[PDB]
Amino acid sequence: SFVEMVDNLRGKSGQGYYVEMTVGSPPQTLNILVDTGSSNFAVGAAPHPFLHRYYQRQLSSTYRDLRKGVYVPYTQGKWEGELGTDLVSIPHGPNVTVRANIAAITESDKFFINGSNWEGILGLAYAEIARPDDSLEPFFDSLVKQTHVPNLFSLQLCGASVGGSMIIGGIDHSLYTGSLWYTPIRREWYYEVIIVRVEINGQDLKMDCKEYNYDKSIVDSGTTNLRLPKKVFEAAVKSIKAASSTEKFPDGFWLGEQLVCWQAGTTPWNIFPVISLYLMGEVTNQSFRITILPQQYLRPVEDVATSQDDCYKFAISQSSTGTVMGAVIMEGFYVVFDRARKRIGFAVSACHVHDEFRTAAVEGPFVTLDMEDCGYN
Numbered sequence: 001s002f003v004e005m006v007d008n009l010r011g012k013s014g015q016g017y018y019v020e021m022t023v024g025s026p027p028q029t030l031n032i033l034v035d036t037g038s039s040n041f042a043v044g045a046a047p048h049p050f051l052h053r054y055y056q057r058q059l060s061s062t063y064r065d066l067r068k069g070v071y072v073p074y075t076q077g078k079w080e081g082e083l084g085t086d087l088v089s090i091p092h093g094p095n096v097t098v099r100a101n102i103a104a105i106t107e108s109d110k111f112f113i114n115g116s117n118w119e120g121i122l123g124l125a126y127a128e129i130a131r132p133d134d135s136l137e138p139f140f141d142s143l144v145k146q147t148h149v150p151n152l153f154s155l156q157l158c159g160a161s162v163g164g165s166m167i168i169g170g171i172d173h174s175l176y177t178g179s180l181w182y183t184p185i186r187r188e189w190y191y192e193v194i195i196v197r198v199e200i201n202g203q204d205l206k207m208d209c210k211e212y213n214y215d216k217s218i219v220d221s222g223t224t225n226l227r228l229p230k231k232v233f234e235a236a237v238k239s240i241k242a243a244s245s246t247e248k249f250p251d252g253f254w255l256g257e258q259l260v261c262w263q264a265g266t267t268p269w270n271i272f273p274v275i276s277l278y279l280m281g282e283v284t285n286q287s288f289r290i291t292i293l294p295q296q297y298l299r300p301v302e303d304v305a306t307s308q309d310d311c312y313k314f315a316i317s318q319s320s321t322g323t324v325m326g327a328v329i330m331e332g333f334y335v336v337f338d339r340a341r342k343r344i345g346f347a348v349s350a351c352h353v354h355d356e357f358r359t360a361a362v363e364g365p366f367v368t369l370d371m372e373d374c375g376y377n
């Protein structure tokens, strides 16, 4: 019955993917950001300049106050609110209703986005990183406890404004081609994985693989960019600069500030390298790779100038908190969060990114010795 969940995601480019949900009795409809990089379910519950609607607890007969406060600081944004529970449904999801923890957001700073069309956030990661602490059961845990929905979901994020599918409780085979390749979830807090090798246009970065996972590597639909640890970021930029040296860019471009433009249709895709991330596989000394095209890490931005050219932002960012495989990485892949078997699967998406002479890929098996040494402790 997964067909009902196909294409249940929408969004604006760079503003996040959201799914429709209802909370409370009678049902109040809200668009909820899909975020595998956090674990709190929270909704606007008070007026805000950027909210068109919000959760009204007084109007719901099934609402319960937990009489406790909560706040959540993300990378830049944060909100605080009051904890409670209420009945929750996903119209284009499984036909069930669950009583879930809900943070009613009463104050926020740089959290809600003007024009994003979502009013809440669904943290899909594990209780370990839930606020105020891991005793606050995350939504998906509640879903799995209270219903017969299997303990897994899959995300097909399609580029561009944007659309996609969140298949709750299973895998929909019409959404990907080729084989699914699985990498272990290293620890159940973030969806943490281990990167064991990195190549750019087929050339190994040849760093200590611990550098790739310092201090962690995670899959995060709630973050746009590929974010890389400082040392890896520098090596990667150096290699990508070298490959594209035929053209010149502002150095603020490599920092993600200045967008670069070309005459509509003349974007020199060919001079930007493919990036291959090798992930630890399911059997001994085995890994597989996903290959990212420049169309994924050069994100299209509307030109502020009167010219309708093709302008792009460099969507690879330096991190101090580990590798983040963000939405631009997940796009064009079908990603299976198989919580039941503690693994994440990757396959080429049906809505894969197009290049003239190149193709995003998930390929294996590869042999990689000493993969356990790649994990940072």
Ligand SMILES: COCc1cc2cc(c1)C(=O)N[C@H]([C@H](O)CNC1(c3cccc(C(C)C)c3)CC1)Cc1cccc(c1)OCCCCN2
Binding pocket: 014, 015, 016, 033, 035, 037, 038, 039, 072, 073, 074, 075, 076, 077, 110, 111, 112, 113, 129, 130, 190, 218, 220, 222, 223, 224, 225, 227, 317, 324
């Ligand atoms: C370049 O970095 C800036 C940046 C860009 C983006 C998102 C975040 C940060 C963002 O903060 N993302 C968090 C996710 O939950 C973040 N997930 C992580 C995180 C980081 C700090 C603290 C927590 C805890 C709440 C567990 C989790 C693991 C990285 C979710 C989020 C919160 C608020 C607005 C959002 C998304 O907008 C969606 C569209 C913008 C996507 N780009």
